[PDB]
Amino acid sequence: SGFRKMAFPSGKVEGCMVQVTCGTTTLNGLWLDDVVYCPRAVICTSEDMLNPNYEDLLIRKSNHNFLVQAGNVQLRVIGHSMQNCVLKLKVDTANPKTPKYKFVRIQPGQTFSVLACYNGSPSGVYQCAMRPNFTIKGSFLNGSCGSVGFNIDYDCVSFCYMHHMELPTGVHAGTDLEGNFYGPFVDRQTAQAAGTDTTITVNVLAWLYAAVINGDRWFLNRFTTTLNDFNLVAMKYNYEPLTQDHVDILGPLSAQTGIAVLDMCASLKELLQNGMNGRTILGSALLEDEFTPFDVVRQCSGVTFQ
C-alpha cells in the first residue's frame, strides 16, 4: 500500500551526464555513444542573450572551442552540428555506459522523471508532468540547462525532455532531444509567457482510482453522469475536456476497481462542486493531476483492498 510521487531509478541516465563549456558558459550535456547532446544556448555570450543568431554564432566556432568533461576525463570534440535548438558534439570516445535508449516527443499530460544536474553532476531526481500549456513545474537553478527528463519502459531509457529556461512565472520550458521546444517558446531572453494552464482531467481520474485501490472510497457517490454533462462541469473549473479516448485508457483501472469511468466522473464533479470539506485523498488536500493511468497501474497492486 501507499502512493507516492515516484520517479524512475536514475542510474542509467546518471552514466550519461557530462559538462559542456563554451567560453565562460557552462551547462550539462547528454553523452550517448559518441555524441554529446546539449542546448545550443552554450554558444551564447552574456550580452547577446536578447536576440542571438545561433547559425551566425556557431559558424564562428571550431571543434576545439567546445570543452566537454565527463567527470574526470576531458572528451575531444571531433565534429559539431546544430539541430533545431540542440547541438550535437561528436566526440572521439563512445560512452561505455550508454543504455538502450530512444528519443520520444511526448504529449501534454504525460509524466516523466527529471534528473536535475549541475556541472555534469546529478543532484536529484523528481517526477514532472508536461502541462497542457507545455511548461513543466520543475525545480531548477542556474547551471541546470541541459538536464534531461525520461521514462524507462523495461531497460530502455526514453528521453523526452532537455531543460533550457525558466519563464517569469517560475515554471520551466525545454525541448525534445531533437531540439524542438515544447510550446511556443524560443531560446532567447525576449518577452515570453506561458499560456493559461488547465488541469489534466484523465490524470485526476486515474489518481482517484489509485485512492480506491489503496482502500479509500469516501469521495465516491451513487450518481453517474454523461460524458457531455461532465465536460460542461470540467470547462467551468478549468479542467481539460475528457475524451472517449481518455475513457478507454482508464479502462483497466475501471475494471480492477469495479467503478465505471463515468461513475468516477460523477465523483469528480461532486468534488469540484463541493470541495473536499477538510478531507484528504492519498495525503493531498488538492486534486492531484501528475499521475497518468499508466503511472497508477505501475505503482499500485493488482489487488484493490476490498
Binding site: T24, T25, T26, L27, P39, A41, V42, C44, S46, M49, Y118, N119, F140, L141, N142, G143, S144, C145, H163, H164, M165, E166, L167, P168, A173, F185, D187, R188, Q189, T190, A191, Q192
Partner: peptide
Amino acid sequence: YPKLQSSQ
C-alpha cells in the same frame, strides 16, 4: 524576462 539557465 525568461532566463536560459546556463551558468557563468
